[PDB]
Amino acid sequence: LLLQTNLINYVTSIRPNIFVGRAEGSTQYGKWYFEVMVDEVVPFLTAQATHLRVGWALTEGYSPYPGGGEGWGGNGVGDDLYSYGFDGLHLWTGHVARPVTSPGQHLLAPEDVVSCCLDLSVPSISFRINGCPVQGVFEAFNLDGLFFPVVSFSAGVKVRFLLGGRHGEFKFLPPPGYAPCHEAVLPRERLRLEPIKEYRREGPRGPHLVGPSRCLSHTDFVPCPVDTVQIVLPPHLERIREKLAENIHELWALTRIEQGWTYGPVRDDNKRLHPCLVNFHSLPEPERNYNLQMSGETLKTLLALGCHVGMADEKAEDNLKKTKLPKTYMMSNGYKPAPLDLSHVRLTPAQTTLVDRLAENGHNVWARDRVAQGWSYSAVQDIPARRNPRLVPYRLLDEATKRSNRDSLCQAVRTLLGYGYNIEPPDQEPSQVENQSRWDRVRIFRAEKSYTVQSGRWYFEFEAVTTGEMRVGWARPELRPDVELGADELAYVFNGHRGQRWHLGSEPFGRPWQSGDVVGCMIDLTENTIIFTLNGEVLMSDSGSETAFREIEIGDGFLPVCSLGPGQVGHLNLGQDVSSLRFFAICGLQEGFEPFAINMQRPVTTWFSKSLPQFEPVPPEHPHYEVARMDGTVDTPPCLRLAHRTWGSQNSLVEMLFLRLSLPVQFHQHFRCTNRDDPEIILNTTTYYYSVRVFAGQEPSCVWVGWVTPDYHQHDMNFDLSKVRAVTVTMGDEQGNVHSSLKCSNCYMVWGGDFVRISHTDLVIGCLVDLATGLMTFTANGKESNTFFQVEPNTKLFPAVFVLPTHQNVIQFELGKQKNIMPLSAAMFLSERKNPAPQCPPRLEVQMLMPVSWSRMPNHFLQVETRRAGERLGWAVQCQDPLTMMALHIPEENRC
Amino acid sequence: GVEIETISPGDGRTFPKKGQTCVVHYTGMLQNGKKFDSSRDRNKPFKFRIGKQEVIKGFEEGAAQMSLGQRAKLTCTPDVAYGATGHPGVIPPNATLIFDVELLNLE
Amino acid sequence: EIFIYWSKSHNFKREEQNFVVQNEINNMSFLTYSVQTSLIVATLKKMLPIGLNMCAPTDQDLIMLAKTRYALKDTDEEVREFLQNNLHLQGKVEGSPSLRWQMALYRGLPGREED
């Protein structure tokens, strides 16, 4: 009942920028192997034991924000269902440690070599320690997102990543069929060790705030071209079917003539003397007409894209000629340009964009075909192993190969343009790659509410390290963390991507910044005005006013606020040291303004918008959702009914709603195996019950009813029971025979569509838990379902319903009892363990999932050092100065 | 009653005979995973003479199997721990304790 | 000097309003009708920080006192001795905290020599 506190170490995580995944028709191999060599570990640098785990993690939810978190903080590899870790004695996942037998087990000590494997084919994550198999395997886990290696550690460790090849030597042969992890660096990046998602990095002059980063989704490795089959070939294309083919029959041959690759009558193409500029008649017939119909195929891509041709001017055939250059002279049947010659011809930007996507659709058809023949990607080419360094979608290819591909089709479209046939751009359709997660877009860093200013004249600077979408300005204390700055009335901010004011909307105001610009924001609360300066020059509106905003009411106060978009960095200088402020004196000093932090001896504490979905109580004043705490008549048990206020109205917000009741039911620490009520059964029972009434009108296929563990942070606006986290930790003997197959998750739910012709009767889904067996059961409408769950001892499980509203009467929690099954209130409250009368005390209240919440930024962060130790030593990690935190633990929610 | 699980091996040669004080730094937790004590927070190693029954029982068959420098984890059942009465205000009745014990020096 | 002659004359202001009305000067594109947009006051507004730069923050107090002097329309020449008679005006950088950070910047300026 009383908030518990303790001192806990800070824990961080480091990964290579190697991401591997699996999907239908993905260009990625599915068998990966990496090692970590432990060099030094101080077992107890603080009171709390030193943290060190290795493992794999997922790119769609493994975000270990420094500081608090699940349980007692110190979240590393294995403190959620997105990471899979190992510490030498235990296998960690879902914040549960499960002992694993290894031959000589012990915590990770100096001179230890941990070999982690991922076969994403079954999905599995094996391990070895010092070359000895670790008898325990994660399996059957979620395969969305991308997997990267990761080590979690507190201060006082030194480790070394071994990625094979020139980044390590593995000390141990990878088990057969596995690929070293250095073969997954994409052709545009360099192998390096980086922290997981971060909101802060150290900078030259001071800390650099960092906005969200864009990680590759597993569907960015599948090449998805435009189908080029269902295209009837037009007359105007077959009319030009030849020259556009003749000009790409030896165009690749033109570059190397009169060089070491100079043709010879004895040989032909592909004989280190390739050119053979004579004609394609001398060349083999199948590849010949294949080249003709490949020129046609490029034109077919032009058709499917939306390119059409039209002839206007003088026929280029007349005013074009073939040039027998002194270069490219050959003895085999005369000399000529290897492709078909062309005179002065130009290309408009429409053709540039068109040839870019035209080359993309060539690469992506080629890659698709190669994958369909089994091939995959590898930064080192292995032909007999059928792996290529270029099996990636065009967007991920390197600029050298992009250009090399673009050259050929640029020549083709150039030859087409010479003949005067129009290259018609297609229609333009604006599309967004990712739309659901609108919240994983913007990070808002504000000063603490304790610094709110209600008077005086204040100043602070913000350096735009990357010209992008960032907003800087002043903000009232009760700033919502989930609205863009200035959209509401709680912020007066400046957006620099294109110069815009923001308060209750947008107005064009000022220049756009470039990289390195310093925006000095200042407020005069005597005149009630806000001024922005860009590099010491005041920004002026078009009307001529020198104040961005005027007539601002002082109100409760104002705070410095900053908003960094995806991939955006910035430096917020509140001015604790005046000399640091670069453009203060030029504009801001003589006018009377003071730096915001002028004697904040300790640097100003800041809070950021933490995009981790927490469950929070439904606000009593909410524009859309209302909760009625209906009491209990004789026929009806106590309820908590959810109603949608604005259904049918114009401003209706219809979206997935993740509801849960505030208090959990805890399972017994030891399990038993190793109408009117019978008083002795009801008093000696451990089965508990609660139902949910899905009212008529609310479609039963849009409701999921059940339980959630206290670590459900998944605000997924497209929910289904295949998007719930899952894993299967399997413990076996020396031979591999299983001894345990524990199945873990965080959402134990049933879909109302399993239970459901016309819908006018409500659906009463009942849920039962046996707290001394660990077994969970559901009843559809009286009939027993076929979904049973088993949960290990001592777990917590909140009641929960996930519903997409389809009626203004959505659902209704019902805290009743069956015959010889106690109600929830008996399980939830200790005082009621023997009371069989259903209750609904004021602590039981429906909570909903909020996408974003404010969170403190730590004053001091861990100092990790990474360096490529050598070609054979591999990448090294080293943290040695300790950091602690005085935690505060909310016991019912199991969070810190 | 007490289940010793080695976390990091010590010497496996010198074991605490009766009458040798044992210096052990430790941390203790209810089986549900909550902490009631650590010596590392106080910052001083805890010394006890084995054979004088100052410590709870399981803590006394338990730190006897350990060797010098070893770090292990003991799981004392209430029979070989406080038991049905408890340590009022610290340990609830009928409780099993888990101790991360590091036997630092003997005497 | 131009500005004090600006304020000390009245018909001159009307003639300025004349010039702006018969000559249709935008008075805005120049800067980027009312006396607010007078180029005299606009130029002095833009040139003011340079002037204030010489006056150290420790002289900010004298100024507040001299505000009274020009309020009662005291003689321009005698303000000199109004300021040598009222000489103990400059305060203490240690005794006044805000000055502890203003005087630092003023002390740091390479063009601002204490000599």
Coordinates of C-alpha atoms in Angstrom, one line a residue, chain A residues 11 32 80 91 105 161 181 241 250 350 367-368 521 610 666 680 686 691 745 769 852:
Chain A
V11 CA 21.5 0.5 -16.8
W32 CA 22.8 -15.1 -37.6
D80 CA 10.1 -6.8 -21.8
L91 CA 17.5 -16.6 -19.4
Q105 CA 27.3 -22.2 -14.8
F161 CA 31.5 -7.5 -29.6
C181 CA 26.7 -10.6 -38.1
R241 CA 10.3 -1.3 -80.6
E250 CA 25.9 -3.2 -76.8
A350 CA 10.5 14.7 -65.4
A367 CA 16.1 -8.9 -56.7
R368 CA 12.7 -10.5 -56.5
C521 CA 13.6 33.3 -27.9
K610 CA 8.0 9.9 -23.2
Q666 CA -2.3 -11.9 -8.0
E680 CA -17.9 -24.6 2.5
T686 CA -9.9 -19.9 -5.4
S691 CA -17.8 -10.5 -17.0
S745 CA 2.9 -13.2 -22.9
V769 CA -9.2 -17.4 -12.9
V852 CA 2.5 9.7 -24.4

